Design a protein around this ligand. Sequence first.
Ligand SMILES: Nc1ncnc2c1ncn2[C@@H]1O[C@H](COP(=O)(O)OP(=O)(O)OP(=O)(O)O)[C@@H](O)[C@H]1O
Ligand SMILES: Nc1ncnc2c1ncn2[C@@H]1O[C@H](COP(=O)(O)OP(=O)(O)OP(=O)(O)O)[C@@H](O)[C@H]1O
Ligand SMILES: Cn1c(=O)c2c(ncn2C)n(C)c1=O
Ligand SMILES: [Ca+2]
Ligand SMILES: [Zn+2]
Ligand SMILES: [Zn+2]
Lengths: 155, 417, 145, 48
Amino acid sequence: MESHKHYTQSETEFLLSCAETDENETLDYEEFVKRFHEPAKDIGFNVAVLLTNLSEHMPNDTRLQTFLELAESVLNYFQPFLGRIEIMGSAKRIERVYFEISESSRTQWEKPQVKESKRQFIFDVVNEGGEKEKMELFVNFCEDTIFEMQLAAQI
Amino acid sequence: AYQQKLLNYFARNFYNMRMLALFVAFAINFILLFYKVVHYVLEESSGYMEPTLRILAILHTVISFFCIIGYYCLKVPLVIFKREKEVARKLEFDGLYITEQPSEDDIKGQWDRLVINTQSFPNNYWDKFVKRKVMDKYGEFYGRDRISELLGNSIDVKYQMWKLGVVFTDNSFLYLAWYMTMSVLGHYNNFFFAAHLLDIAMGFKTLRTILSSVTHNGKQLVLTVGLLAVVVYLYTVVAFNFFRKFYNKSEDGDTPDMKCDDMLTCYMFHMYVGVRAGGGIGDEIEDPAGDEYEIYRIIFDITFFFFVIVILLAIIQGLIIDAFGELRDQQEQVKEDMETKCFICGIGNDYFDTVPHGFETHTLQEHNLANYLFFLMYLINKDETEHTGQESYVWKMYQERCWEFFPAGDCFRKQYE
Amino acid sequence: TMSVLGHYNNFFFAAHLLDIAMGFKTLRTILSSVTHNGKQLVLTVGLLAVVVYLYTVVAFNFFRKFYNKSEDGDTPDMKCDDMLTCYMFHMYVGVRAGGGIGDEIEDPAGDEYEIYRIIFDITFFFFVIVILLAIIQGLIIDAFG
Amino acid sequence: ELRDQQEQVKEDMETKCFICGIGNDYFDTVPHGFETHTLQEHNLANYL
Ligand SMILES: Nc1ncnc2c1ncn2[C@@H]1O[C@H](COP(=O)(O)OP(=O)(O)OP(=O)(O)O)[C@@H](O)[C@H]1O
Ligand SMILES: Nc1ncnc2c1ncn2[C@@H]1O[C@H](COP(=O)(O)OP(=O)(O)OP(=O)(O)O)[C@@H](O)[C@H]1O
Ligand SMILES: Cn1c(=O)c2c(ncn2C)n(C)c1=O
Ligand SMILES: [Ca+2]
Ligand SMILES: [Zn+2]
Ligand SMILES: [Zn+2]
């Protein structure tokens, strides 16, 4: 742990708290990551949305960057998983939306029976399909690819 | 339990097996280049050239059979899903097999009357309560004796008979059947693996465009070849009635000299020779010098060269080259439109640019139509107890099918900053 | 390194007039346009060598008796009933002609295969000389545009 | 020219109003925006 230059010596000892109680001065390999990792990746997610939700909504804040530059070992871990769209939200005003993208769905928007169905669609719509049915043809496309992404899963 | 192990191997390797039934079908049509005349193959490398074709021609029918089993488990389940959606959204949101009863056209509408009598109708459409929704919406104007009757080792035989009506009428499945039914004929005669190099055409992109441009401007092309067969026909009736004495395909007059004084054989002479020449018809005709009809003959040939070889054969080539100019440019335009506007906003490369990487981050993070697809996959796994304030103004509007929630013109910088 | 070879043989200073091409501006543009639309050009010449190949296998299996490059029958008459030499005959002569293949072939008049032969030649003239040889010229002239 | 002339005419018919002369864009702004504007609001049949 010390040779990776990530944790300082005030943190390499805290990580070795007891961690075994087992007779050999060792650990358990996949149980120590079972103990402590996964009950802070979805707890810690909503923290990452909240610091994201404040920086984009409230700019020009000197007080916020002091936390924000400390969070960069989190905000550069969850940015693979942080899906950000924009909708016209119920008040005639456009408000951003933040959500959670899995890892069994960023790796099946690859797998080229799904990639070929995109390029067969993008060319079909930006060529033909008027403005009274453009976004209908998008929402009708998202329903199919979700069936494709289910289909490429059980293979 | 071992069947679904193999059957899920072939659907995984379908795009990576169709590049194997091409590197084989070159190796057939390279050994087959050595034939010689009874037709018997010689050798150029060694004696083991004949068995490497009898090996290679049974290996090709096997691989061309695994590329339709892998098609039957990769893309034909999807074409069912896009078909069971459109039926189920027709008799429910609109009403088709109760109120409308479709016409003699749209045979797929007529064919899909066979499916709604089945037990397991929405097999792929995730929406197994259509048959309860119609009787609650259309059980009032029409009696629920009828709607209960219209809808409803023993497999879904009335449904499996419907499904094969969708697989066989499917476009890309027929090509995977014609690709295999030649490999059955490839052992009746070895020369039928020469019609497998036409998988180059439906395999590349700038060769699929040529094969489309022959028929893309097609509905005018028949009406222009159909003017060739009338101008050359009207050049027959003049030549048949006036100029029979020039039309000799014969030698010196001593021979049993062959003529063209018969309508059906003067006509095929004017089209097998009169079109493909360079000078129209004035090549393969005895020279007019000592005749009274000479001036009436130079006028006959010049307007043949001008109407059929200068005009009508240039604008038949013109509709096949300048359809290849549209279809290449169409693609170019699509790419340019993709790299100069936003898909969902529809704004421009200019207004978002205004900063380094201005349009790039606007479409990588702020809209990024991947994300609008993961967001709709989000609401399917979220429970309706858990929908927040905006994930249920969306999910109400999507169940309602209104779609006023995509950003029409503005995004974020068009009101803030 | 050609000027070293220019004294092994005097004829190697004839490959120094190709310094005209990388020397001017409207001649450097021609020499670029051959390969500028190049990645489609191989896939279109590569369709010529397959359509003319599929016109060989039909002519080899059906029409061997017309393919005489010979004189009057009395001579030791030369044929094209061998695949590799029927194929190079369809490409050295069948492409560069004006009428496709209906020039250098004995005339079909007294045969039962006559209607099956006029269809063979018209679609040779239309597919390989009217279309596929116009859109191979088309990618070298409209890359210069 | 004469094929393109016809093409242009068709395109002009499907992107402007005959009597207004305004555009497919300003009337669109809503689902079926240009369609109802020329089916009901002007519709040169009705002026006849
Ligand atoms: N809403 C949008 N979402 C994503 N891309 C967009 C959008 N609007 C415009 N674009 C443009 O589309 C381009 C994306 O390229 P494209 O969709 O052809 O696939 P790609 O990212 O090139 O990867 P591949 O070609 O392998 O699918 C981006 O460069 C972007 O400029
Ligand atoms: N003032 C207008 N009145 C009617 N149509 C208009 C007007 N301005 C533009 N248009 C366009 O003209 C189109 C009408 O098509 P057109 O006039 O060619 O005949 P049609 O409705 O297609 O029927 P047909 O071709 O059988 O006569 C409409 O789609 C409309 O978009
Ligand atoms: C359950 N369910 C849905 O409810 C659904 C869907 N796509 C859209 N909806 C609405 N999919 C794929 C789905 O499985
Ligand atoms: Ca709630
Ligand atoms: Zn946008
Ligand atoms: Zn108007």
